[PDB]
């Protein structure tokens, strides 16, 4: 149901997008953009999207609910789609991709090219013009704007930490620690799914405590670390392991590795040979890291609900407790 | 020396860069970012950011110009070169450009390669960093925020312009147009060299009224306008002592202008030789430019152009300071 609620209001937004601004003397580009941004959305999940509507609809007052703020829990959560595809639309670019959702690329098709750079200059931007139009004049505005810039460089930051991790060279293993992995899933991961879909529900339900964002921001963080814990368990249990991905699986068994069973590891890391594969899964066996998963899930669960349940009444620990439930199997 | 003034306090800004912000978590990112700054920003007229340092002095009653003020206005000048850095590092990528400012480009390094993308977008967003710092509690604040993401699309847009002009149909030159080359260069060039910088200084200096906002806004194109008019001829009849137009296949408003002025016959010439590697095909060109009297139009068109714009200044409210734009137009009119 609101999957088709959510992709409803695009049309508009697309029209929000071609107008206040100096597009109307280029309605060429206005044309050329809207073709961008409709691609670039086009397919997909819209979790990230339907998290910022769900978060609001959660922490606002009923009474306070309108036909209206909807509506612009909608567009907010538009925004972080426009977001998300200019993320994929340059892992694709620096990851030499090919297709995506099917399709080709948007880099791969022969008349855009890697003009796509310039495309994502464009995208991004145009959060800023939905912003103006529906928050110009509110009293949040500032916070959302800056909410924005502050957004491009956390993923930025995580970008930079991945492409890092990804340069390296195939035998050297010292940034797999749980020190960097844990940075990694901060800044490319979870603020964008997590922390800025909730950060910007709070704001439209004009809930703006400092220690509160902190609280909240704490708990976002906490979530995505407990869903990528999971999602990298689920990838070896996927190709993860002939990529040579820096997995919560690839830390801990460097953790516990005697000196010789580390050299396993890094000799067969990174390898599609089955006889390679096998090996490092017999190795993640041998150090008891699904016996470790197992204790460590329930852990850290149990520990993010009772985090929710003290959360003030202010947090929804209601929106908390589902978000939480929703990676739970 | 005032190059060397705003040189000074480049490495004050990067500090700011790093410090307060999140990158004390991750050291290994602030230090990769001095890093992609220094290198982009490196050597250069640093001249966009003079503007804004000069168009700051100029429009403020001079009791108020204070040591700190000196410094604020330089830091949004280097927010600029900053954005231009930006501007021309994915400039380089998408035209596959190969060597900038005498150094190679910086995607082109060994372990960079198309990471290059990543690193511009963490070049733009350190803009925000540096103007929370030094702005965060001021009326102004906002505006220097909002007008910095208009920048990139405003520029975006320019850039969108030219690598979709000269990114299809080798032959077909059926774009260069008057039209479309001043659209290109209001968007790409005359904004973020004029525009911006002086739209910088007036809020610097508490200029509000949005007239006055306004008239600096034409005031500027029309000087990128001309600007780029020069750079254009210069390209083409530089003292090498004192470039890659023909060759790079520009719309240079040499080429716009050749065309209007071309026959049928002439018109075919210029599509065999205009976009050519060969000295052979380069001359014929040049001698073309010469049939169509284009060196004398330039060097008539360039003294009306000037004319034009010392009057617009002068005719400038004095709030606006003829007197700042009437140097601009100098600091210009005979280069090489």
């Known amino acids: 149901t609101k999957k088709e609620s959510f992709e409803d209001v695009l049309p508009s937004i697309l029209n929000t997008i071609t107008t206040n601004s100096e597009l109307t003397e280029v309605p060429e580009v206005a044309n050329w953009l809207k073709k961008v941004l409709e691609y670039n959305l086009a397919g997909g999940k819209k979790a990230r999207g339907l998290t910022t509507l769900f978060a609001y609809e959660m922490l606002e007052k009923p009474e306070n609910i309108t036909e209206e703020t909807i509506y612009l829990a909608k567009t907010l ?6 977001l998300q595809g200019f993320l994929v639309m340059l892992d694709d670019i620096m990851d030499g991709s090919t297709t995506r959702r099917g399709v080709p690329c948007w880099y791969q098709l022969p008349e855009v090219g890697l003009a796509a750079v310039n495309d994502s200059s464009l995208m ?3 959060i800023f013009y939905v912003l103006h139009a529906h928050f ?4 949040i505005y500032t916070n959302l704007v800056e909410l924005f810039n ?8 995580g970008q930079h930490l991945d492409v890092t991790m990804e340069r390296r060279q195939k035998s ?7 020190e960097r992995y844990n940075a990694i899933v901060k800044y490319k991961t979870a603020y964008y799914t997590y922390q800025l879909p909730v950060c910007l529900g709070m704001l439209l339900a ?6 509160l964002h902190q609280k909240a921001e704490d708990m976002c963080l906490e979530i995505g670390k407990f869903f990528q814990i999971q999602d990298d368990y689920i990838d070896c249990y996927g190709t993860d392991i002939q990529e040579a991905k820096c997995s919560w699986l690839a830390v801990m068994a460097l953790q ?21 594969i096998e090996r490092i899964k017999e190795l993640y066996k041998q150090l008891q890291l699904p016996e470790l998963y197992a204790q460590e ?19 929804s620990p209601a929106l908390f407790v589902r978000l939480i439930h929703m990676i739970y199997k």
């Open 172 to 178: 050297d293993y010292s940034l797999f620690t749980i």
């Open 124 to 126: 991004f931007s145009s």
């Open 297 to 315: 899930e329930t852990r850290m669960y149990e520990s993010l609900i009772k985090q929710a349940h003290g959360l003030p009444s202010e947090l």
């Open 206 to 211: 004009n809930i703006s405590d400092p220690v």
């Open 150 to 157: 502050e957004s491009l460089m956390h993923t930025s930051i």
């Open 256 to 276: 516990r590795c005697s000196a010789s069973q580390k050299i396993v590891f890094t000799t067969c890391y990174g390898s599609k040979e089955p006889a390679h």
């Open 136 to 139: 110009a004049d509110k009293k």
């Open 77 to 82: 959560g538009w925004c972080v789609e426009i």
